Design a binder for this molecule. Structure first.
Ligand SMILES: Nc1cc(F)ccc1C(=O)O
Lengths: 355, 356
């Protein structure tokens, strides 16, 4: 009776008011109504047409009003999505995540999964990387088997863990279809990085697609992840990563702004075209056979190798609480050429296989 | 990709999300043409239909939030696009219309149809009222009245009623999505600008809000060029000339002008809107035919609804003759009812429709 079209509509009407009368907690409650209604839309009935119309109306109004670009709304939106998530409970040390929002309209290499693996081979670092859809999937490893119930069994012995977002965030599965149909960006576009199922992570790199969004996204990350020291990163070319060409702005949350350039890591610049994504199987083959194998070195100017080294250098400096980027390079180089990075990944894959 | 595609619609929605918005009045026109093609060619229960309903919902919601749809040039272009799916009437070649936008939250008597019928009894006046039932309950199938039959009824009838659904097939297509949205959109204010007969040269257009009236005055001049028009707003919150308190009129007089009306100027007491309520289409029609039009009430009985009809007729008549002698309008509205002319003019229209 309460989780209805009529309730959703009363929220939509608050958004159309001048000025708007929708609080951040109102947004939280609205999204629970929406996720409730979208489970009911199993066929293309007229009921489904009505619900899809009302849901599209709500999210569209939220976007025009720009309240979804606001710290407290992003936080509340994330909170509501996570109510339909499998979360990991661990018994209560530097544990890091690296992920971006996407939505930069770019097709760059999976540098976050690769740098997470390289960072995980540096003594003292533990990496639990949470990402959307596959790369590790294609390396002989059924990511289906990594869920709420199995993450705790794997936690103790693994320097590196990978968590595939869709096996945790069922809520995101319900809005999947209306998001594709909408074509426009909505609050769901920036939630990915704030849906980490394991609360033990106390440091992260979160890429956003836009400079405009970064300051409020910084404040949302501090609301969703109160303990964590966080780098928010935007590549000036329009990139939710530390960019292999031109500059990257960093918003530093330390419970602050600076700039990164490849020259600061003793690296050449590489255009996005040189750092392209080939899809998860080819990306996996490149990472396994070109990078973790020790084929390339610092000084070879191999773009995707350079790109991984740089994002690992940043994970390292964040973990140690300094800005010695060339020390980070050295430590990333060591993690590759010692075989430590490849061992860390192989341990994780054996862990998952024998579950 | 074809121009009449989800991809084209999506591109227009994105212009509304921009800071500031980059959707022009002509873009809204194109956008509406795209919406009407998509909904026209909707495959029932298809994934397409769900996606089309999602994109259309998104556009119309985006548009209402920007408030762009309450601007003269946007309102006019939106009316223009809707009319490309309308059956317009072709007439060989003073004709008036009276209608309001609706959305004032009031449920008073159908003064629009009543005053249009009383006006049609006045020698020298022809009334072609366009509206979105009351006349359907008096024994006449309004579905018989369309673009191909209006011409047959045009020459022998002082009064005509046009039910909008039998003309605007474009409005028909957005009908279901308007109910699903449950919020006001551009479509909530276009009805009065969709008159299918170009021969109408004068009209009273009611609007629900003081804020909308100045932009709606401009929109009406773009949609009906060279039409003497009264935009009217009753201060109580009414898309008619109010039976209580003051009504503001914006005068589109092809020759900016505004003036205030109140009942005292007609020789009439005020009446609360509770004293002037709708009893639904059946009883409204019986009140109109058997009491009002049969001459059971006179000027000076202070019958609220009878007074309500006289006043709106007085305005129609003063508009028609190019003066503001309102009491003269009341004398003429009175002569129309008590002569049996108003009732004859209606009864003629009913019988015309019957023999189609
Ligand atoms: N579609 C998703 C599903 C998840 F589980 C997590 C993130 C997304 C996303 O849209 O980024």
């Amino acid at each position: 009776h309460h989780m209805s079209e009529a309730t959703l509509l009363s929220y939509t009407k608050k958004l159309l008011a001048s000025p708007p009368q929708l609080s951040s907690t109102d947004l939280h409650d609205a999204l629970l109504v929406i996720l409730s209604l979208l489970q009911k839309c199993d066929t293309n009935s007229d009921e489904s047409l009505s619900i899809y119309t009302k849901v599209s109306s709500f999210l569209t109004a939220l976007r025009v009003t720009k309240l979804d670009h606001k710290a407290e709304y992003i936080a509340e939106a994330a909170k509501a999505v996570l109510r339909h998530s499998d979360l990991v409970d661990l018994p209560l040390p530097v544990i890091l995540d690296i992920v971006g929002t996407g939505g930069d309209g770019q097709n760059t290499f999976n540098v976050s999964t690769s740098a997470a693996i390289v960072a995980s081979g540096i003594q003292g670092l533990k990496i639990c990387k949470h990402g959307n859809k596959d790369l590790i999937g294609t390396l002989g490893c059924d990511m289906f088997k990594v869920n709420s119930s199995t993450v705790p069994k794997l936690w103790p012995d693994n320097t590196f863990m990978f968590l595939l977002a869709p096996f945790f965030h069922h809520g995101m599965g319900h809005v999947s279809k209306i998001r594709k149909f909408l074509g426009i960006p909505t609050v769901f576009n920036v939630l990915g990085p704030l849906l980490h199922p394991v609360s033990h992570v106390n440091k992260r790199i979160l890429g956003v697609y836009s400079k405009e969004l970064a300051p409020e996204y910084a404040k949302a990350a501090a609301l969703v992840y109160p303990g964590s020291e966080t780098f928010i990163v935007w590549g000036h070319v329009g990139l939710d990563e530390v960019s292999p060409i031109g500059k990257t702005t960093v918003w530093h949350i330390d419970p602050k702004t600076f700039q990164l350039e490849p020259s600061m890591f003793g690296l050449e610049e590489h255009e996005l075209s040189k750092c392209a994504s080939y899809g998860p199987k080819e990306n996996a083959r490149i990472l396994k056979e070109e990078v973790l194998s020790g084929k390339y070195h610092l000084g070879d100017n191999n773009p995707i190798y350079d790109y991984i080294l740089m994002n690992t250098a940043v994970l390292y400096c964040l973990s140690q609480g300094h800005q010695n980027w060339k020390e980070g390079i050295i430590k990333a180089e060591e993690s590759i050429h010692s075989g430590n990075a490849l061992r860390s990944l192989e341990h994780f894959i054996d862990s998952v296989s024998s579950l």
